[PDB]
Structures are given as C-alpha cells and as structure tokens.
C-alpha cells in the first residue's frame, strides 16, 4: 500500500518531505489523466462544524470528480448535535459507522486530532481546526509553487500580511523548510510580525530569513509573493488604515518583478490585492484556487485507495 493508505491527515508536521512529494506527484498525475470512478461506491462525510464555502465547495468537488458520494453538513448553528451537548467524541463515534472517511472543519484546535481517537479505522482529514492546522491549503500552495517554479528548493519566497495570526503562512513556512535552500522575506506590520517559535525553528535549520518593512524592497528578488488578508478586527481602524498603505499590492509595484514571480493568496482578498493585478501574468490566486481540486483529490485517492495506478 502507498505510505498514506488509511492514514489520518491532520497536521503538516506529520507529513515528511517525501509525503508531500508523493501527494504532489499524484495531484500532478490526476490533473493530467482523471480517474472519475476511482472512489466509486465510497461515501464521504463533509462535516463543516465551522462553515466555509470556499473549502467545503472545493472538497466536495474533489469528491464528485472521483466518483464518491457525499453526506454532511455545515454551520453548527444549534446542532442539538455537538452543540446542544453531544460531545464531538460521541459524534464521530456515530458518524464513523456510516461513512468511509471524514473531512471536517472545526472552530477548536485539536478537534480533528481528537476525532482520530474515536473513528476506529475511518480516516479523518483536517479541513481546518481553530488557529492550528489547515494542511490541505498548504498541499495546494506547494503544488502551485512547484507547478509555476518547477521546484520546492531554492526559492526566494516572500510572505506578506498578518504573519502573526495567518494560520496559512505558518504552515507554508514549516513545509517549505522541509526542503533545501529556501530564503524567506517577512514584510509585515510591526504589531503583526512572524511568531518567534517559527523564527527559532528556521535558525536551527540554518534557513535564510529577513523582515522587510515594504514590498518594493524585495520585489525584484522574489520568486513567490505570498500575500495574506490583514484582518481589520485585529487592529484599530485608525491603526489599521495607518498601516495599510505599506502592505497592499498594485500592478505598478510589480514592474520591478522577475518574469516568473507569481502572487499567491489563500483567499479571500479584497483590499490587499488590487484588481489591476488581476490582469498581469503574475496573478496566480485564482489559478491557485483551482489547484485545490487536484491537491484534495490526490489526498483522498491515496488515503482511500490501497495502491495508486498512475
């Protein structure tokens, strides 16, 4: 069986460089030659305990293109189930007797992990759990970075935005720091600088990193520009608007950019990336969103299917 056969996908730290490459290898191959009935007869649970259309819609499309069926729900408004008082443990324990696999999103960290403990054989896939892990978003950023740069080692990767709370930039750094010779640029507001636990992590590896106050500084150097939505709530309206200016991207700022630099962004964007950028060769968020289907499909295929015919 493949290395991920029946394994739970919960954290990005749980997967090694070789696991990422396998996932990537498959994704790339399912994108090429579709296997619309690979998961035929399987039934998958879409438990969005915390609503999320982008992610739910993506996962589900991934299920439907592999032949799998889907049952599930979204927004735990009341769910006299889980919410009223059913302990998650008990909810999984029951659901694991219906489906073959469980994709779930929860507001609390460690939810997907705990679930693992009450599902017996049923593999659970973390689609987000509090401010902890969102592994699928990363499998998809990497696929995009590899597809566009042709490699996951030796990149000049810049990360912009809310680098202190951005659940995504933390995961992308960890994974990218599994490969070789990646240099990182950290342009972020002072009130929102990259956590120290990630910085220390890098130094031990001996990875190159530096903080920048503005994007124009590292413009002509970066291969990847990873922007993240700066949550206004995190800041004061005056503070926010004071900050802002030094962190939104316009097309003109890109004239300096290399030929292969792609701007990525988990989405939604709104203020941070101007629609003028939408039309430049560098725009890659939307394409990036579409790669989510291939990244997620490859994940279910491997987990659900013993051996993968590619």
């Amino acid at each position: 069986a493949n290395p991920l056969y029946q394994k739970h996908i919960i954290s990005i730290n749980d997967l090694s460089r070789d696991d990422l490459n396998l996932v990537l290898a498959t994704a790339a191959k399912l994108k090429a030659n579709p296997q619309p009935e690979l998961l035929k007869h399987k039934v998958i649970a879409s438990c969005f305990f915390e609503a999320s259309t982008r992610t739910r819609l993506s996962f589900q499309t991934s299920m439907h293109r592999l032949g799998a069926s889907v049952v599930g729900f979204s927004d735990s408004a009341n769910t006299s189930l889980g919410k009223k008082g059913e302990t998650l443990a008990d909810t999984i324990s029951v659901i694991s007797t219906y489906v073959d696999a469980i994709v779930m999103r929860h507001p609390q960290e460690g939810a997907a992990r705990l679930a693992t403990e009450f599902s017996g054989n049923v593999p659970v896939l973390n689609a987000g759990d509090g401010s902890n892990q969102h592994p699928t978003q990363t499998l998809l950023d990497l696929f995009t970075i590899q597809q566009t740069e042709g490699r996951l080692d030796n990149l000049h990767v810049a990360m912009v935005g809310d680098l202190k709370y951005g659940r995504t930039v933390h995961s992308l750094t960890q994974a990218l720091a599994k490969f070789d010779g990646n240099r990182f640029y950290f342009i972020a507001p002072d009130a929102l600088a990259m956590p120290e636990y990630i910085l220390d992590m890098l130094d031990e590896k001996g990875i190159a990193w530096s903080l920048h106050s503005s994007i124009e500084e590292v413009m002509a150097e970066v291969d990847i520009l990873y922007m993240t939505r700066v949550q206004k709530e995190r800041l004061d309206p005056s503070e926010y608007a004071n900050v802002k200016a030094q962190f939104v991207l316009r097309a003109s700022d890109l004239h300096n950019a290399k030929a292969n630099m792609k701007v990525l962004h988990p989405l939604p964007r709104v203020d941070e990336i101007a629609t003028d950028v939408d039309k430049t060769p560098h725009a890659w968020y939307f394409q990036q969103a579409g790669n989510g289907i291939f990244a997620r499909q490859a994940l279910l295929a491997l987990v659900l299917n013993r051996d993968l015919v590619l």
Binding site: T87, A89, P107, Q108, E109, G110, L114, G130, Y197
Partner: protein, 153 residues
C-alpha cells in the same frame, strides 16, 4: 530508611518509599497521581525535619512498586526526590526522577479554545528541554507553553 527521634517508627515490609519530596509537594503528588486509591497500607510523613534540606514530605506505599516510567512523572514536581524499592526491610533499589518525554493526564491545557477541555480525553503534553527551561506541547491544539504557565493550572 529508618526514622527514629527516640520513638519507635514504621518502615514497610516490602514496597516503595518516595523520600525527599519538598515541603507542600507531597500531598499534591498524592492527589495528582491518585496514589491513595488502593487497599494498601500507606504511611505519609509531612513537614518532616529534613534539616540539611529543612523540611520534606515522605510517602511509603507498602506492597506497591513503581515502574521507572511512573517515577519519571515526578520530575516537574519533585526532581530531587529519591524513589526507594524496599524488600525484606531493605533498600534493594534506589531510583531518581528523570525528565520524561510525555506527561499524561495530570496537566491542564492553558489554551482555552483547546478541544481537550470539554471532551473525554486525557491531557498529554510532549516535554522538550531548552537551556533547562521546559516547554510543554499539547497533543491536541499543538501549542507550546512554558511549564510555568501550565503548572499554574
């Protein structure tokens, strides 16, 4: 060992003696690890004249030995503690607490939004040393805290 001021004192037959526990940490250990929950003859000596070490606590659990793993769980609370295996009224074994790698269901995750709180799970934190400062990592929310913060709860 052998307690005697001038007056006749007990020393279990065969069993374990957790001697040299710092003052006030004794009872916590009895609570925490639920040591008192057996039908065995436990004798506790609290606030004893450790003189060189001022005042210490002391436990003797007759007919009950502790696996070295169970001995390691004492580290965060009583590292200088010496665990003695007694047989035939004599110390057959003398262990010393050592930094474990994992400390189960005894600590509480300071992360308030940690799923660990409501559900039926045992806490479990991965220990990791640093210039001798112990960071502890919750198995669930995957966050890392300083033992000072966790132990406060």
């Amino acid at each position: 060992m052998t307690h005697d001021n001038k007056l006749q004192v007990e020393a279990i037959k065969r069993g374990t003696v957790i001697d040299h526990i710092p003052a006030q940490i004794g009872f916590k250990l009895l609570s925490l690890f639920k040591l008192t929950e057996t039908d065995q003859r436990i004798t506790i000596g609290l606030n004893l004249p450790s003189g060189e070490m001022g005042r210490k606590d002391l436990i003797k659990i007759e007919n009950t030995f502790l696996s070295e793993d169970q001995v390691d769980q004492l580290a965060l609370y009583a590292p200088q503690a010496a665990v003695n295996r007694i047989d035939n009224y004599e110390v057959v074994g003398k262990s010393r607490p050592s930094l474990p790698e994992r400390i189960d269901n005894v600590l509480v995750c300071p992360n308030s939004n940690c799923i660990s709180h409501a559900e039926p799970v045992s806490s479990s934190f991965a220990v990791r040393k640093r210039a001798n400062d112990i960071a502890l990592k919750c198995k669930y929310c995957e966050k890392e805290f300083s033992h000072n913060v966790v132990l406060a709860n």
